[PDB]
Design a protein around this ligand. Structure first.
Ligand SMILES: CCCOc1ccc(S(=O)(=O)N2CCN(C)CC2)cc1-c1nc(CC)cc(=O)[nH]1
Ligand SMILES: [Mg+2]
Ligand SMILES: [Zn+2]
Length: 297
């Protein structure tokens, strides 16, 4: 099988440093990377967050798990595919390291966030696809996540005690549920209102959970923070999924997306951690770019 070959190659490969793979950079891009290379980057993410160590992950199991996750995204979907999931996780890794968020979280929270980031859009069929089995989409994504986590040879949480496991699974679930933008809109007010008054405190369980939710959305949307040539390309992908699947209004829509959803979030995040500023800076630069295009109609 192509996949048995794929596992062997992945399992046998040496994993380059985080620095070599550029995964610490907020401006990271995956366009030039093969599927195998994104798999290596993902291993390095688990490794340098001390997750392989602290939770006793077997190499071939983590490899198998990454390949299962990748396989359960749909290639024919223009934007919501493995590369979007991979990028979300990279942004999580970057925010944890470069953004210095790692120190504010527990190991179990970090484990959950990385798994959630990678898993949060599993089996997405594209924005214009919706079926009736009756945050519905997000429950399906989590279901896929759980299914892969319980599959033979893919159990990367096997090293956790049952108590750690249940705690981790619940964090993973809330984190994936949080990627529902309706949910983010409903909850962000509290977050912003809290930051506004310097009342925001991570030691409070309820606020911790709120922050994990906000962090998920920030990574999820982080293409909007990329260098202009990259953002332009990603916008092209989402435009294809939005309209093609299955006056140019796009620049105006992007400005509206940035204003309504993106700016305040990245603003809020930089307050929590000044080192996350490149996300806010990048988002502001893209607004300027899209706005100018919008002004030319
Ligand atoms: C680039 C072509 C247009 O893209 C958009 C148009 C409108 C809006 S929106 O804020 O008004 N709105 C629409 C209804 N919802 C689903 C919630 C959001 C968002 C985007 C957009 N989304 C993403 C994330 C998938 C990335 C991105 O770059 N742009
Ligand atoms: Mg989603
Ligand atoms: Zn997403």
């Amino acid at each position: 099988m192509e996949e048995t070959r794929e596992l062997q190659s992945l399992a046998a490969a040496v994993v380059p440093s985080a620095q070599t793979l550029k995964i610490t950079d907020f401006s990271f891009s995956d366009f030039e990377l093969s599927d195998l290379e994104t798999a290596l980057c993902t291993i390095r993410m688990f490794t340098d967050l001390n997750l392989v160590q602290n939770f006793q992950m077997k190499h071939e199991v983590l490899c198998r798990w990454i390949l299962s996750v990748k396989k359960n995204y749909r290639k024919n979907v223009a934007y919501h595919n493995w590369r979007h999931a991979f990028n979300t996780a990279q942004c999580m890794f970057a925010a944890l390291k470069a953004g210095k968020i790692q120190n504010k979280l527990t190991d179990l929270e970090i484990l959950a966030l990385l798994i959630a980031a990678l898993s949060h859009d599993l089996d997405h069929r594209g924005v214009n696809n919706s079926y009736i089995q009756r945050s519905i989409m997000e429950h399906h994504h989590f279901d896929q996540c759980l299914m892969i986590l319980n599959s033979p040879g893919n159990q990367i949480l096997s090293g956790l005690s049952i108590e750690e496991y249940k705690t981790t699974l619940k964090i993973i679930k809330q984190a994936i549920l949080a990627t529902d933008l309706a949910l983010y809109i409903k909850r962000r007010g509290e977050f912003f209102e809290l930051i506004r008054k310097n009342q925001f405190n991570l030691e409070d369980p309820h606020q911790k959970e709120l922050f994990l939710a906000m962090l998920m959305t920030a990574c999820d949307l982080s293409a909007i923070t990329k260098p202009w040539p990259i953002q332009q390309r990603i916008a092209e992908l989402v435009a294809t999924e939005f309209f093609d699947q299955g006056k140019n209004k796009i620049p105006s829509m992007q400005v509206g997306f940035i204003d309504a959803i993106c700016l305040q979030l990245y603003e809020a995040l930089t307050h929590v951690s000044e080192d996350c500023f490149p996300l806010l800076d990048g988002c502001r630069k893209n607004r300027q770019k899209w706005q100018a295009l919008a002004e030319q109609q």
